[PDB]
């Protein structure tokens, strides 16, 4: 599912993102919308051999299973898949386990060269919340 951009500002405002350890809204659609084009169903192949899962391209690595990537963990405690379904609860609960590992949203490298010190707000813009 491709969300739009204030479709998806109130599914992450309802499942609890709006200031998450002081992160505006504007930060995670901003995250969103760099990371995925606001598609649950995005990968992509890392080169260390790990995948970046859903909304918000997940790591295998640390934070979710799929059975292909040596030596990983799962943090999140869940099947990466579950970071592409339509429901986006379980990205939303994985995110912010990330988003509390110490160092911010400076975890999503897009949101840092691309998010970070911009007017985020604007991708709020013109919606009902």
């Avoid at 939303?92 to 949101?111: E, L, Q």
């Amino acid at each position: 599912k491709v969300f739009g951009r204030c479709e998806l500002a109130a599914a992450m405002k309802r499942h609890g993102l709006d200031n998450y350890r002081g992160y505006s809204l504007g930060n995670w659609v901003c995250a969103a919308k760099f990371e995925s084009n606001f598609n649950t169903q995005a990968t992509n192949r890392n080169t260390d051999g790990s995948t970046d899962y859903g909304i918000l391209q997940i790591n295998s690595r640390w934070w979710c299973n799929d059975g292909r990537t040596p030596g990983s963990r799962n943090l999140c405690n869940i099947p990466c898949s579950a970071l592409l379904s339509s429901d986006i609860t379980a990205s939303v609960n994985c995110a912010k386990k990330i988003v509390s590992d110490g160092n911010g949203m400076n975890a999503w490298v897009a949101w840092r060269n691309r998010c970070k010190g911009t007017d985020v707000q604007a991708w709020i813009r013109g919606c009902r919340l």
